[PDB]
Amino acid sequence: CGLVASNLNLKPGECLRVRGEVAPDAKSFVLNLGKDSNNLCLHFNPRFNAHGDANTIVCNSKDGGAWGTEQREAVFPFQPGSVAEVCITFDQANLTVKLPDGYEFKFPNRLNLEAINYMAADGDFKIKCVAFD
Amino acid sequence: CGLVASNLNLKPGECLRVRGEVAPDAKSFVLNLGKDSNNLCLHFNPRFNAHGDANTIVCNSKDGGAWGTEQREAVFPFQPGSVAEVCITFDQANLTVKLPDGYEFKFPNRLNLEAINYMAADGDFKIKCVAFD
Ligand SMILES: CC(=O)N[C@@H]1[C@@H](O)[C@H](O[C@@H]2O[C@H](CO)[C@H](O)[C@H](O)[C@H]2O)[C@@H](CO)O[C@@H]1O
Ligand SMILES: CC(=O)N[C@@H]1[C@@H](O)[C@H](O[C@@H]2O[C@H](CO)[C@H](O)[C@H](O)[C@H]2O)[C@@H](CO)O[C@@H]1O
């Protein structure tokens, strides 16, 4: 596992900027956001070649330990062995994810979180900077 | 009640930079670094008016729950209600703390830690960025 942070107290409208290094041999990487490891408003999982996906971003929620319905994006501005950065903001209805190519997308806030208190990176994403505004 | 981070994997010679907002009414604030909450290589506790001290940085270690011998610094470049940044590095002999105004001091590495994996802020220091360099 990578860096895990708790008591983040990220509130609607605030921008979370996360930048890190993707491992050279990575098949995917993960950044998880939510209340705790069972309760994710955003599982952000760029897949290079994993679980049947090549160069696709897969996003999901997790509620009480159960995965929701995945969403897949149309762009893939990530490479193994390079710096990856994401910017995330939310309100109680949706998260908005901004990627390093400037592409923005929405993901529904299925847990109706009023605050994001938990962030976790996997072992393929080495956090170099996190800014909570 | 502030940000807690784990799996930092900060190794000797690496630098950790932490920037946060000191609460307007703070009597002190705390940044703790170590293996875990009971084993701290550095309790960094700038005190405005707390525990008998006035405008003094108190540093200590904690070993299996037990506080060590306090060290007090001679300088105090902090104010309640303002942003503060500290940078920390270590080696086998000492941690080095660099303060906002450029001042540096050493604190002994009493636990003989070879990595720092845990960090926590108290509720008077609202962390805004963390960088690893
Ligand atoms: C096309 C499709 O539905 N594929 C899914 C896989 O994505 C899924 O893999 C898991 O997906 C979750 C997120 O939803 C995590 O990323 C987890 O690590 C993956 O293993 C598998 C297993 O649920 O089911 C389908 O194949
Ligand atoms: C002036 C003097 O000696 N004061 C000390 C306090 O520093 C001390 O408080 C604790 O100090 C530790 C770090 O060593 C933590 O900051 C802890 O939160 C404080 O309560 C108290 C208790 O040992 O003793 C004197 O008052």
Swiss-Prot record, chains A, B:
Modified residues (Phosphoserine): S28
BP term (GO), one: positive regulation of inflammatory response
Broad class of where this protein is predominantly found: secreted
Pfam families with a match to the protein in the record: Gal-bind_lectin
Reported tissue expression: Expressed in placenta, maternal decidua and fetal membranes. Within placenta, expressed in trophoblasts, stromal cells, villous endothelium, syncytiotrophoblast apical membrane and villous stroma. Within fetal membranes, expressed in amnion, chorioamniotic mesenchyma and chorion (at protein level). Expressed in cardiac, smooth, and skeletal muscle, neurons, thymus, kidney and hematopoietic cells.
Protein location: Secreted, Extracellular space, Extracellular matrix; Cytoplasm; Secreted
Lineage: superkingdom: Eukaryota
Binding residues annotated for a beta-D-galactoside, in chain numbering: H43, F44, N45, P46, R47, H51, N60, W67, G68, T69, E70
Modified residues (N6-succinyllysine): K106
Gene Ontology MF: a single term: RNA binding
Keywords: Acetylation, Apoptosis, Cytoplasm, Extracellular matrix, Lectin, Phosphoprotein, Secreted
InterPro entries tied to this protein: ConA-like_dom_sf, Galectin-like, Galectin_CRD
Domain spans labelled Galectin: 2-133
Annotated positions of the N6-acetyllysine modification: K11, K27, K106, K126
Subunit note: Homodimer. Binds LGALS3BP. Interacts with CD2, CD3, CD4, CD6, CD7, CD43, ALCAM and CD45. Interacts with laminin (via poly-N-acetyllactosamine). Interacts with SUSD2. Interacts with cargo receptor TMED10; the interaction mediates the translocation from the cytoplasm into the ERGIC (endoplasmic reticulum-Golgi intermediate compartment) and thereby secretion. Interacts with CD69.
Its biological purpose: Lectin that binds beta-galactoside and a wide array of complex carbohydrates. Plays a role in regulating apoptosis, cell proliferation and cell differentiation. Inhibits CD45 protein phosphatase activity and therefore the dephosphorylation of Lyn kinase. Strong inducer of T-cell apoptosis. Plays a negative role in Th17 cell differentiation via activation of the receptor CD69.
Name listed for the protein in its UniProt record: Galectin-1
Protein's organism: Homo sapiens (Human)
Classification lineage: Eukaryota, Metazoa, Chordata, Craniata, Vertebrata
